[PDB]
């Protein structure tokens, strides 16, 4: 049939898949033993077919991943950590063993227990530490309760996006939470600049909440939540930071967009610097010979600056004083020469998220003629 020869070889399959998966969200939640699968074991689940008898029918995880499996149609690689059960809330979980170097971008924890949330926080912040192996993860957790409680039941962590919910919210909390994370991932896991807010870029699809008149957090409470932190719905996709080491105002690490772009710059500079391996870096005579591949610390700083002067506008913003924001000091330079050793260098930059749009106060004042 003109296909006998052997040149073309066609497979007409409806359920094909070409996408380069990426986008490796993890979902954590308690389970019912109906799910035939080893607990405390990361399982990169497929689409629905391998369902409730894989994680536990009925239990929170079921609905959570259902919403997640929902939302995003294509783009993510869903991962599940089906924790087991036991004022009960069996949450204990110091488990950097089961989940390890294999790194996940988005995290969603369907449990209002402060301890579990804080443990996830610690794990993420550990991943986000100066330690040379990096993957730059981010989590999403929910938090119900009254205004006083919501405020009190919080922290400084900027590695989560703790969602606030009034004690009237019809939908079961964790549900929305999952959806939120889901959307974010599948949306931003290629473009980090995007920010999930407004109506078009962020409306949770799988919610279908019953409409009413009395919304929830009144305007005052809305301001309280927003300023303080939480991502009251969606609008204001910030990460509760509100502070810093000592001085409170640290606008930089407020938006999630800022955090994703910072991770992007980190991985870009990491995959870029690797062209300075081998090389040979003269540091005493600062005079490379003729015919030998080599570089000098000053030359390296020049290269770094040139680089940081191209990604500007797209990753960084303006670099006010380039002469000071980017500094490269050699081991021998800082340390008075007794404890110096060629090979060690110190680079320090100044991240400035590209300024975005915000409120536009209007003061239209009518008159006649």
């Amino acid at each position: 049939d003109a296909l006998s020869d052997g040149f073309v070889r066609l497979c007409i399959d409806p359920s094909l898949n070409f996408f380069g998966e990426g986008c490796k969200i993890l979902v954590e939640g308690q389970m019912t033993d109906d799910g035939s699968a080893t607990p405390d074991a990361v399982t990169c689940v497929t689409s629905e077919l391998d369902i409730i008898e894989r994680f536990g029918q009925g239990s929170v995880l079921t609905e959570s991943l259902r919403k997640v499996f929902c939302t995003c149609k294509s783009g993510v690689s869903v991962y599940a950590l089906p924790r087991e059960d036991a004022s009960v809330n069996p949450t204990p979980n110091d488990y950097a063993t089961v989940v390890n170097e294999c790194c996940f971008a988005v995290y969603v924890l369907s449990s209002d227990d402060t301890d579990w949330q804080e443990n996830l926080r610690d794990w993420i912040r550990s991943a986000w530490d100066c330690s040379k192996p990096q993957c730059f993860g981010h989590g999403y957790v929910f938090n119900k309760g009254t205004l006083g409680q919501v405020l009190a039941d919080g922290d400084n962590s900027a590695e989560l996006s703790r969602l606030a919910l009034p004690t009237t919210y019809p939908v079961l909390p964790y549900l929305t939470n999952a959806a939120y994370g889901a959307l974010s991932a599948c949306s931003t896991c290629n473009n980090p600049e995007l920010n999930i807010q407004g109506q078009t870029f962020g409306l949770l699809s799988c919610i279908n909440m019953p409409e009413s008149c009395t919304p929830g957090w009144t305007f005052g409470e809305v301001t309280q939540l927003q300023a303080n932190g939480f991502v009251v719905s969606i609008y204001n996709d910030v990460t509760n930071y509100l502070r810093d080491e000592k001085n409170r105002p640290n606008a930089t690490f407020r938006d999630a967009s800022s955090r994703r772009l910072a991770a992007a710059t980190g991985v870009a500079l990491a995959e870029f610097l690797q062209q300075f391996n081998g090389l040979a870096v003269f540091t005493k005579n600062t005079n490379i010979r003729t015919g030998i591949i080599g570089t000098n610390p000053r030359l390296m700083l020049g290269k770094i600056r040139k680089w940081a002067q191209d990604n500007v506008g797209t990753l960084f913003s303006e670099f006010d004083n380039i002469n000071e924001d980017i500094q490269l000091l050699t081991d021998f330079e800082v340390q008075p020469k007794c404890v110096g050793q060629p090979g060690i260098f110190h680079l320090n930059m100044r991240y400035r998220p590209p300024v975005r749009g915000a409120r536009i106060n209007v003061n239209m004042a009518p008159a006649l003629f």
Partner: protein, 128 residues
């Protein structure tokens, strides 16, 4: 003070835009006392009437003479490869030019080439 003018290091990185191969960064040596010449402002000006001026867009140029290295083919200096050059004077100044391209090649005898490089922007370091 103003430590004596002159070049100290010339690093060049060749990249062929056909096979995507990379060579360098290889150092080179000045052939004479002439120094590489630079122009950073990527905007030329033209004299209008009565003090005005027409500011349009342009390139950042560079003039660099170097002795050919007997391992890199000569064609790579006559504009068959993208060059990444870096100069460092004695007073500390270092100028970097990335993904440049050799424009208007001139005849060379095989041991001393003079590249007219054009690029989008050159960065200066201004020694402390």
């Amino acid at each position: 003070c103003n430590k004596q003018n002159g070049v100290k290091n010339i690093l060049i990185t060749f990249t062929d835009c056909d096979t995507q191969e990379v060579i360098g960064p290889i150092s080179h040596e000045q052939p004479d006392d002439t120094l590489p010449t630079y122009k950073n402002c990527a905007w030329t000006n033209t004299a209008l009437t009565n003090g005005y001026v027409q500011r349009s867009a342009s390139n950042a140029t560079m003039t660099l003479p170097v002795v050919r290295d007997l391992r890199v083919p000569l064609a790579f200096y006559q504009g068959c490869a993208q060059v990444d050059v870096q100069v460092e004077k004695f007073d500390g100044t270092v100028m970097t030019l990335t993904e440049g391209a050799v424009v208007e090649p001139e005849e060379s005898d095989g041991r001393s080439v003079t590249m007219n490089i054009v690029a989008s922007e050159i960065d200066e370091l201004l020694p402390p």
